[PDB]
Design a protein around this ligand. Sequence first.
Ligand SMILES: O=C(O)C1=CCCOc2ccccc21
Ligand SMILES: [Cl-]
Ligand SMILES: [Cl-]
Ligand SMILES: [Cl-]
Ligand SMILES: [Cl-]
Ligand SMILES: [Cl-]
Ligand SMILES: [Cl-]
Ligand SMILES: [Mg+2]
Length: 343
Amino acid sequence: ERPTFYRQELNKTIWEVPERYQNLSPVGSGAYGSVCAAFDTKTGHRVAVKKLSRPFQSIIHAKRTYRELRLLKHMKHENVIGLLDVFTPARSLEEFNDVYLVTHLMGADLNNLTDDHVQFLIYQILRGLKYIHSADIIHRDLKPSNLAVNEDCELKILDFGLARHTDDEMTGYVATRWYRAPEIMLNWMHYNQTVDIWSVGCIMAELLTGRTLFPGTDHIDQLKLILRLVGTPGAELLKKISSESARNYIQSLAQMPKMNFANVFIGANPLAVDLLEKMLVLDSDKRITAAQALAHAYFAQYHDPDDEPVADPYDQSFESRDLLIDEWKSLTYDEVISFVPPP
Ligand SMILES: O=C(O)C1=CCCOc2ccccc21
Ligand SMILES: [Cl-]
Ligand SMILES: [Cl-]
Ligand SMILES: [Cl-]
Ligand SMILES: [Cl-]
Ligand SMILES: [Cl-]
Ligand SMILES: [Cl-]
Ligand SMILES: [Mg+2]
């Protein structure tokens, strides 16, 4: 049976939601969309409710809406954001126009530390990342503002199905670039899931020192900071930079050796230094993986190979499919009506 819906004026729009959701109030800066906090009377959770803005206005927007719903419906892991509910007030495909998504309300992020704290926080990021990567999903945007943390230090990874970041968003002295792997920052080559391990290394360093690792003022300044720490590329990696122009620019720089990480991260646990050296490798083929990193001695007090699960298979063949607006809309409607809530 369909629930009863009620209407309220929120975020310059009329919101129409099931009676179970009460005490709606706008929250956040708008970085993830148009979002309200609420109390869910069915589960007892404080929740975040997102109303999608013009979901089917173009082919690009319609496919992005379908992508967000597919990703959120798949993610079922303690250290990753999950979907509590999805709904529409429409009674048929013909009147379907708005989509609402519901998740747990998270109070703070990593921006808002003993060595034991660093162990637990990085362990949880890697546990969630092992799950994400087992489904052949690449996050691309791990950074402190995308990591929700509660009073008991428990952590969830955020940011799935939103618009790809623009060139302007990545320009200048901006946190949205400081965590990016060099091969994606400069479009050196076709990248893969190894980009996310670079980002984890940048996050871990910052928790240990209290300071951004590579706070570049622009793309080139940031590359210079990176190469000073990890060394200039050797002939093996240069061959793999398929961009002719990017390869030529790199060879204009004087060669530099990799620095001594024990003299950069002064006083840190030697096991933390060792792990950072294995994450912050310029050649992405040679970086440690999430599954390998969980078994590193730095995490000995938390690692349990019987409690680090992998994901069900995730079919993303739709990503290479060309459809019309109304076809993406119908696929999205089908995914709304088939949703089954978690236990
Ligand atoms: O990455 C996302 O899609 C979300 C992040 C948290 C804030 O907005 C959301 C609301 C509902 C479901 C998901 C999200
Ligand atoms: Cl209800
Ligand atoms: Cl609707
Ligand atoms: Cl951030
Ligand atoms: Cl992106
Ligand atoms: Cl030189
Ligand atoms: Cl699937
Ligand atoms: Mg993002």
